[PDB]
Amino acid sequence: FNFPQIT
Amino acid sequence: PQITLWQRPIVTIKIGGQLKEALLNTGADDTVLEEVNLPGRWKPKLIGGIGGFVKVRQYDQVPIEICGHKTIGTVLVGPTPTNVIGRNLMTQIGCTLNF
């Protein structure tokens, strides 16, 4: 998929 | 280990007495796993921020084995499309990007 995670 | 990126970098982990798989995700600040029952203390945490927020349970200093490396770090437990190992735990295992 595509995953840039910020709180 | 040296992991190329032609495929998704999915690795085996051991957490909470269970064997699971998770994605090594340098785009993720935090580690988020679903369907794990962890002992000890937690607090709610709001994550994401697109469309709303998602509430997860934050467990601190959780022992976890990632691709054979026994480390300790924060694990967020809650719904996630894919189990994710974030930077917080990749630092613990000494994982770097190299080119």
Place this chain on the structure above:
Amino acid sequence: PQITLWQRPIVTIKIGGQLKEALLNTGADDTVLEEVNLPGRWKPKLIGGIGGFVKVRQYDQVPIEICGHKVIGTVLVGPTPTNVIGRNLMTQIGCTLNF
């Protein structure tokens, strides 16, 4: 370089005659950049999938320099919360995860 993961792995890129910054994201299959004008052919592509889909322009075989490495790959152009270099271009630059 060898890039540790205590901070977000943001690097400088050169694309479409512009200097930009983007996140090396091993959790992303594809590269998505915003505010770039690329010449030549494109086709619409639907990405994401949570809450709906996001439509972007797919440009194939785009020359791009990533942290000094001149390579070629598909670049998706559309508004994105953060510019992202996905696995498709990390393979081109020879980027691996190591621990």
